[PDB]
Design a protein around this ligand. Structure first.
Ligand SMILES: COc1nnc2ccc(N3CCC(c4ccc(OCCN5CCN(C)C(=O)[C@H]5C)cc4)CC3)nn12
Lengths: 126, 126
């Protein structure tokens, strides 16, 4: 079976609105979401619908852009690095599960290149 | 390389008619396939530029996709149900030709084709 999706809102966690977190939602997540290769990464991997019975035997830290969008909206992250780690986990999971050079891996590699271009333009803390 | 222009979906010089088979192809066949979990790569012409497939249109000279078939049905472009069925078959076979047995995209096309064949076996009598 599929696991429940990652936690996205926690009222017990402290919250802060910052220019780096705003950039991650308004620029980074927005740009990646609209990319031509984003669709398979917009929601948690549905291992049942996709016939991947070993997906959650191999990937114990699933991550997807729909979860990242919700985390940003709900002030789940205190630091930009926590959000950046979730984007990195999403790409790494794809590289671990799939064979190198597969179409899905080339999609993730292109999204990662675009992500890293946008993270180089992360504004300095105000 | 550029993409070719998409297949024509409307031609005001062609005659038009409504048939129970053409209605069934839009209402039942195309609608059922469109909602399938693996339909999304087949819902628009193959954009070889955005998808980074430089040899696609060197191999596939009769491109076809469900977005085009849907528009053809909505524009009364088809006179015979056979023309619509041929377009679905062209779409699947193009996928089998460009890709290789066992590729994820081919398994997606095979699942759609199985459903298509089930729905076409119940095509109403003219
Ligand atoms: C008619 O289209 C058409 N004709 N020739 C072609 C040639 C390639 C091609 N495409 C490019 C590849 C794409 C695609 C491939 C696999 C895939 O998922 C595999 C399962 N995933 C699920 C999601 N995550 C994040 C994963 O790590 C693993 C577990 C998803 C999309 C479908 C479109 N389309 N194409």
């Amino acid at each position: 079976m599929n696991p429940p999706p990652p936690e996205t809102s926690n009222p017990n966690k402290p919250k802060r609105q910052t220019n780096q977190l705003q950039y991650l939602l308004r620029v980074v997540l927005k740009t990646l979401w609209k990319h031509q290769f984003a669709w398979p990464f917009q929601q948690p991997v549905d291992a049942v619908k996709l016939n991947l019975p070993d997906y959650y035997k191999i990937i114990k830290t699933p991550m997807d852009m729909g979860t990242i969008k919700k985390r940003l909206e709900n002030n789940y992250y205190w630091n930009a690095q926590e959000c950046i780690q979730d984007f990195n986990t999403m790409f790494t999971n794809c590289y671990i599960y799939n064979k190198p050079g597969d179409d899905i891996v080339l999609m993730a590699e292109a999204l990662e290149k675009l992500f890293l271009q946008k993270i180089n333009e992360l504004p300095t803390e105000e």
